[PDB]
Enzyme design. Structure first.
Site, PDB file in Angstrom:
ATOM      1  CE1 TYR A   1      -1.745  19.046   4.498  1.00  0.00           C
ATOM      2  CE2 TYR A   1      -2.960  17.639   3.189  1.00  0.00           C
ATOM      3  CZ  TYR A   1      -1.954  17.763   3.833  1.00  0.00           C
ATOM      4  OH  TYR A   1      -0.992  16.947   3.973  1.00  0.00           O
TER       5      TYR A   1
ATOM      6  CE1 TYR B   1      -2.894  -3.374   1.283  1.00  0.00           C
ATOM      7  CE2 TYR B   1      -4.388  -1.724   0.141  1.00  0.00           C
ATOM      8  CZ  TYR B   1      -4.065  -2.894   0.528  1.00  0.00           C
ATOM      9  OH  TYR B   1      -4.949  -3.880   0.337  1.00  0.00           O
TER      10      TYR B   1
ATOM     11  CE1 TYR C   1      -4.618  11.073   1.702  1.00  0.00           C
ATOM     12  CE2 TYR C   1      -3.509  10.490  -0.500  1.00  0.00           C
ATOM     13  CZ  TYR C   1      -3.737  11.480   0.654  1.00  0.00           C
ATOM     14  OH  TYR C   1      -2.515  12.371   0.729  1.00  0.00           O
TER      15      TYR C   1
ATOM     16  CG  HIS D   1      -2.132   7.769   3.781  1.00  0.00           C
ATOM     17  ND1 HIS D   1      -1.685   7.912   2.563  1.00  0.00           N
ATOM     18  CD2 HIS D   1      -2.468   8.818   4.308  1.00  0.00           C
ATOM     19  CE1 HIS D   1      -1.589   9.140   2.233  1.00  0.00           C
ATOM     20  NE2 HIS D   1      -2.000   9.791   3.458  1.00  0.00           N
ATOM     21  CG  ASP D   2      -3.438   3.601  -0.184  1.00  0.00           C
ATOM     22  OD1 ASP D   2      -2.792   4.458   0.195  1.00  0.00           O
ATOM     23  OD2 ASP D   2      -3.147   2.610  -0.974  1.00  0.00           O
TER      24      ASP D   2
ATOM     25  N   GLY E   1       0.965   1.166  -5.253  1.00  0.00           N
ATOM     26  CA  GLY E   1       0.050   0.075  -4.715  1.00  0.00           C
ATOM     27  C   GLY E   1      -1.380   0.374  -4.121  1.00  0.00           C
TER      28      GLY E   1
ATOM     29  N   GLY F   1       2.621   3.718  -1.481  1.00  0.00           N
ATOM     30  CA  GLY F   1       2.927   4.262  -3.051  1.00  0.00           C
ATOM     31  C   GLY F   1       1.877   3.943  -3.932  1.00  0.00           C
TER      32      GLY F   1
ATOM     33  CG  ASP G   1      -1.749  13.680   3.942  1.00  0.00           C
ATOM     34  OD1 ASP G   1      -2.086  12.562   3.497  1.00  0.00           O
ATOM     35  OD2 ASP G   1      -1.573  14.607   3.027  1.00  0.00           O
TER      36      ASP G   1
END
Ligand SMILES: [Ca+2]
Length: 119
Positions: A67, A27, A51, A47-48, A31, A29, A93
């Site tokens: 932001y 995950y 998003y 994180h993904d 991925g 990057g 983030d």
């Protein structure tokens, strides 16, 4: 945006070049699927997901959303002058950067074969 995310990392994890997190596990990057190989990868899976959730807000683009935040004396702060999209992405983030700091880096998990190990 990614630039800012890059900066959050360099601030919470100054011992490393952000590039070490740009292509790690399944995950971290480009991925975005399969089973997380370790806790740091899980930091990126969260994180993904975060998003993808954020992408649900109209006109909200987490790679590109600029932001408002600050990182000083070891603390990351998503400021009050953020709309729902900015606040949401900034929080994605901020949480990932914090997770990164406390996650073990396993050299073996850098730049793995995604097509073969992340199905
Ligand atoms: Ca990813």
């Amino acid at each position: 945006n990614l630039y800012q995310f890059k900066n959050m990392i360099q601030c919470t994890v100054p011992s490393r070049s952000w590039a070490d997190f740009a292509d790690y596990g399944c995950y971290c990057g480009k991925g975005g699927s399969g089973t997380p190989v370790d806790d740091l990868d899980r930091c990126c899976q969260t994180h993904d997901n975060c998003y993808n959730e954020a992408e649900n807000i109209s006109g909200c683009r987490p790679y590109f959303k600029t932001y408002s935040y600050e990182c000083t004396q070891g603390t990351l702060t998503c400021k009050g002058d953020n709309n729902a999209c900015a606040a949401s992405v900034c929080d994605c983030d901020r949480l990932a950067a914090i997770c990164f700091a406390g996650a073990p880096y396993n050299d073996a998990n850098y730049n793995i074969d995604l097509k073969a190990r992340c199905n």
